[PDB]
């Protein structure tokens, strides 16, 4: 008997559900980059979705795009919206919070990327300019002039984008399982990107924040309560800090329900994958990703908004811990890149899934305290401070880590779920802190950090 | 009398006028601010330091700007001064590599090298300039490089004249080992074609440009060796397509030396973290060596622990080098700390034969070396580190004998016959090194 899915609302740095519980989201990215978009038979199957439910994921970052939404100048593709809604509904029916991502890579199909429709951008690459594809194409001069058109709104691309996202916002209005709209994936600053190095770009981020505010206002004009997800400009991925929400340099955040949506990639891992550079360079992943997390902490203290890591991993099992442990430390949720449709086999049964599939509190009737999960043996410990809520604390128990079943101990509360249950439910004894341990029956278990 | 001689490429070897194979260990002396100093002259004591530590080469900086400060006009006074410095260095046994230096194309970008008159492109008022090294991504700087490779306003023609005048000037100076045609050449607007695995098409253009400059040099000084760098996407781990048939022409020009740099990106952003890049760089050097059969000198490199990687890989291949951080006006000997313990080394400066394997332990001074004797008019000369043997050194030779004095800075070795010669040098009482 599943808990009905509800809207999520930003309360300071937490996301809270309709029952008053603090929610932790773990899930995946599912993005269709190529037209035709979401064609019949090539979207997530009932089987794919069962895999996500089986492994306890409660969120999907679902790709949409400007091109898919408005494939001709000023004309919304309503048939595409029907197909997109079909996928959203299939996911939310099974307890998945769906984040709608206005995806792009390398601006447009004109550069061999995706996102913006060709009709909306004047710039084109010449036959002579080398195109190394992802991610180096961001250094192509024509692609840069493309982004200049966007940030300058030179030919009304932002105006049209606002209309497109407004139409999307309107179509999903009233669906509680839609967790928000992410306004733009990996925004490139265009021709003045070098001003972001070596320590960020205040002036561009002012331009960028104004553009995101405009898109937010367009969304909220059609759907006044839907959360909006704002990424840092993508020089973030080359260790450069964000200057979002930093008065007096950039405006204070005056819009409600805004969530910070950074990515957490290891540079040497990405360069190994896309350039074929030595994998052994991943020795530097830890200090570099620590810097990203330090940057996230800065936004958190400054803006007091929630954060979701909307992309990480990209198939590399060695870097996952860097995101997972630091995310657990701050009680921050995440979406793994990437989970494709039409799986003939379960892709979470190897090295990646052993770390992604975890025992974790999906919803806490209280303020989260410290948490730990040992991805080798399944040891789990969690402490929180109870608050009044209309549902109990729900903890998903990994289907991979406990072959001989699992044991549960609670201090300051009771387990109300059945032995061997997929979800552990905990009710607090009173106002005092609650401590939960879950582990293999023969394990001594973990302590709360 | 064993005066300094010219060096001649014989396949992979550099061979002196006495028939000996030469290994070069030394330093850079390159200063962009030389025109404002009363310039690049090393003090007699600076040179003492180099001599005391066994260094036998200096990469001496020059520039297109200094050689030709107005359109089409050579600075003969500057050439007089430069020649003065060359003579002082060669008189003390230093082989001088003349380095046509640049960084960021020009002073117009906050760089150095090409004179401003030679380049049309200029940075725009709005255009962000992050300085070295990221200024190489500035559109205007890239357009500047396009003028060079396209020769769109004759800048390569003028550079040829400038380097030709330099070459003319040093004709008949044996201690000049060559002219390095251009430091860290940037491909300009086609640099993205060099990723993810090199740019054969651009390197075809680059190779033809280097050949053009080589022709301009050789027309004034027909025997002077020329040193060709790979295009600088090399420093971002991309391989060179120099001398790579069928896509670029085979090497058909005599006395060309390959001149790569060995730098570690991870360092900039203690050794282990640099190994992946350095192994890649050195396998890229091996590719060139194997296909082109030319010598290589590491004309720039330089955390003391990361040096150990470079030095070991250079020793493995019997490849020489010039360390970057050296300068004029040393108040103190800069080789007496951790860097110098690695750079100051017991090594064979000149071998009367074909070098075999060589090993130097920079912690305790253990040294071993084998070679096959050949006909030569001078003996093998091994410099002995002045830092690693506080209680003196012991020497043993199989298949030959030592002719120098106990405690001498140079060990001289004469072969007994045609059989291999093995030399061991170490602290007294040490079991010493063994030949790999
Ligand atoms: Na598709």
């Amino acid at each position: 008997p599943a808990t009905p899915i509800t809207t999520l609302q930003a309360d300071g740095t937490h996301l809270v559900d309709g029952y008053g519980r603090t929610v932790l989201l773990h899930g995946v990215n599912n993005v269709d980059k190529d037209a035709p978009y979401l064609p019949a038979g090539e979207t997530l199957t009932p089987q794919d979705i069962d895999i996500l439910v089986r492994h306890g994921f409660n969120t999907v970052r679902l790709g949409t795009s400007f091109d898919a939404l408005m494939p001709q100048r000023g004309q919304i593709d309503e048939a595409y919206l029907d197909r997109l809604t079909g996928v959203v509904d299939a996911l939310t029916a099974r307890g998945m919070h769906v984040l709608l991502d206005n995806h792009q890579d390398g601006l447009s199909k004109a550069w061999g990327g995706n996102g913006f429709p060709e009709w909306a951008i004047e710039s084109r690459p010449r036959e002579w300019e080398p195109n190394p594809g992802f991610p180096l194409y961001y250094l192509m001069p024509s692609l840069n002039a493309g982004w200049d058109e966007v940030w300058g709104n030179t030919h009304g691309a932002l105006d049209h984008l606002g209309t497109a996202l407004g139409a999307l916002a309107e179509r999903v209005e009233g669906k509680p399982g839609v967790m928000g709209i992410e306004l733009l994936n990996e925004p490139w600053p265009g021709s003045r990107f070098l001003s972001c190095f070596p320590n960020g770009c205040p002036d561009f981020d002012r331009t960028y924040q104004a553009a995101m505010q405009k898109l937010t206002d367009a969304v909220r004009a059609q759907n006044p309560t839907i959360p909006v997800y704002w990424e840092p400009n993508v020089t973030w991925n080359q260790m450069m800090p964000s200057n979002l929400f930093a008065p007096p340099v950039t405006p204070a955040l005056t819009t409600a329900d805004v969530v910070f949506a950074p990515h957490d990639y290891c540079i040497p891992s990405q360069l190994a994958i896309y350039l074929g550079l030595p994998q052994a360079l991943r020795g530097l992943c830890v200090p570099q990703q620590d810097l990203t997390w330090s940057n996230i902490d800065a936004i958190t203290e400054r803006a007091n908004v929630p954060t979701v890591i909307t992309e990480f991993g990209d198939g590399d099992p060695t870097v996952l811990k860097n995101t997972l442990a630091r995310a657990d430390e701050r009680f921050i949720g995440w979406q793994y890149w990437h989970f494709g449709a039409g799986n003939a086999t379960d892709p979470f049964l190897g090295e990646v899934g052993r770390q992604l599939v975890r025992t974790y509190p999906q919803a806490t009737a209280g303020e989260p305290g410290r948490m730990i999960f040992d991805a080798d043996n399944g040891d789990f410990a969690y402490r929180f401070t109870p608050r009044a809520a209309t549902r109990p604390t729900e903890i998903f128990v990994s289907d991979l880590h406990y072959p001989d079943g699992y044991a549960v101990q609670v201090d300051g509360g009771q387990v109300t779920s059945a032995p061997g249950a997929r979800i552990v439910t905990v009710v607090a004894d009173g106002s005092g802190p609650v401590t939960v341990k879950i582990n293999r029956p023969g394990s001594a278990g973990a302590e709360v950090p």
Side-chain angles (χ1 to χ4, degrees), chain A:
Chain A
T3 300
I5 190 165
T6 75
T7 52
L8 301 176
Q9 189 163 315
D11 182 20
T13 64
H14 322 291
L15 295 178
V16 309
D17 68 15
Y19 313 107
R21 303 179 300 179
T22 296
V23 168
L24 182 54
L25 300 174
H26 290 174
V28 296
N29 279 255
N30 182 248
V31 181
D32 174 13
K33 289 172 179 196
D34 295 305
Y37 299 112
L38 305 181
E42 306 204 320
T43 64
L44 289 159
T45 64
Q47 201 183 136
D48 288 331
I49 296 173
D50 191 54
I51 287 165
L52 303 178
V53 169
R54 189 182 310 150
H55 299 307
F57 297 122
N58 64 0
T59 181
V60 174
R61 181 166 180 261
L62 183 60
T64 185
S65 68
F66 190 2
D67 192 46
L69 290 163
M70 194 186 279
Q72 295 91 230
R73 181 171 293 97
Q75 296 180 25
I76 297 296
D77 185 347
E78 300 292 349
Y80 164 76
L81 280 171
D82 292 341
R83 301 195 301 281
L84 180 63
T85 290
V87 178
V88 173
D89 289 346
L91 293 165
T92 59
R94 306 278 265 120
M96 305 295 274
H97 293 278
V98 178
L99 175 63
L100 298 164
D101 181 65
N102 173 32
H103 207 89
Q104 75 81 24
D105 298 293
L107 194 53
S108 182
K109 205 80 212 290
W111 292 272
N114 65 94
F116 280 74
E118 287 180 284
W119 67 255
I121 286 130
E122 184 187 306
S123 178
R124 291 290 182 280
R126 311 327 218 179
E127 298 59 32
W128 44 102
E129 54 193 293
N131 190 335
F134 183 87
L136 298 191
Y137 51 16
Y138 279 113
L139 299 177
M140 293 176 72
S142 65
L143 197 156
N144 277 283
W147 283 101
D148 292 345
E149 294 173 41
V150 177
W151 303 128
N153 198 41
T154 317
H155 310 285
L158 276 182
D159 296 328
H160 289 299
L161 177 55
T163 304
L165 299 179
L168 174 66
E170 173 59 31
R171 185 65 86 93
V172 298
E173 192 173 3
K175 293 176 196 292
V178 167
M179 62 181 280
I181 292 175
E182 188 169 4
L183 299 172
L184 187 59
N185 181 70
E186 300 208 327
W188 184 247
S191 295
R192 303 183 89 268
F193 75 93
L194 284 176
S195 66
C196 303
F197 300 83
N199 200 228
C201 36
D203 291 308
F204 172 72
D205 270 346
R206 187 177 312 109
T207 293
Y208 172 65
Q209 184 171 326
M212 292 306 97
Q213 194 60 56
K214 183 167 180 281
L215 297 185
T216 296
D217 294 349
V219 165
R220 290 280 169 80
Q222 301 282 291
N223 184 340
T225 57
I226 187 162
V228 295
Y229 279 57
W230 286 33
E231 302 200 356
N233 88 64
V234 82
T235 62
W236 177 274
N237 288 356
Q238 300 89 55
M239 309 178 291
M240 296 302 97
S242 176
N243 282 281
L244 290 168
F245 323 127
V249 176
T250 62
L253 187 56
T254 57
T255 309
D257 257 325
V258 174
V259 178
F260 186 56
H263 300 174
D264 182 22
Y265 283 121
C266 169
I267 290 158
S269 176
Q270 290 288 105
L271 297 179
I273 294 162
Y274 297 104
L275 273 67
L277 294 186
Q279 280 177 323
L281 290 164
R282 291 173 302 178
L284 282 103
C285 291
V286 170
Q288 185 246 304
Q289 290 191 261
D290 281 344
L291 184 46
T292 304
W293 285 100
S294 175
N295 287 350
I296 291 167
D297 291 344
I299 292 284
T300 298
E301 65 167 306
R302 170 160 98 235
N304 192 34
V305 297
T307 296
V308 176
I309 308 301
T310 56
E311 292 191 24
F312 76 106
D314 202 7
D316 188 332
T318 70
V319 303
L320 301 184
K321 65 189 65 92
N322 301 327
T323 302
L324 296 168
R326 304 262 89 147
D328 280 0
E329 269 164 23
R330 295 150 180 78
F331 212 83
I332 279 165
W334 47 257
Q335 289 147 343
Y336 173 81
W337 188 271
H338 173 270
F339 178 76
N343 292 276
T345 190
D346 186 346
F348 298 104
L349 303 182
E351 279 173 10
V352 171
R354 191 76 185 177
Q355 300 172 265
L356 294 184
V357 181
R358 310 160 79 73
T359 298
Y360 77 102
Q362 294 188 338
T364 305
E367 165 73 1
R370 293 311 299 284
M371 176 176 69
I372 192 143
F373 180 65
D374 186 317
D376 297 316
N377 72 357
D379 284 348
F380 171 86
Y382 179 46
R383 173 176 294 120
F384 64 92
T385 298
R387 91 156 72 82
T390 63
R391 287 291 163 121
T393 290
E394 291 186 53
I395 303 169
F396 172 82
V397 186
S398 170
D399 64 318
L400 300 185
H401 289 77
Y402 319 103
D404 306 303
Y406 67 88
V408 197
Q409 307 175 52
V410 188
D411 188 32
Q414 280 78 221
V415 180
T416 54
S417 48
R422 159 168 193 284
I423 301 291
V424 168
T425 58
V426 175
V427 182
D429 285 340
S431 60
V434 180
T435 303
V436 181
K437 285 181 66 164
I438 301 170
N439 47 256
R440 293 163 173 176
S443 171
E447 293 177 350
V448 176

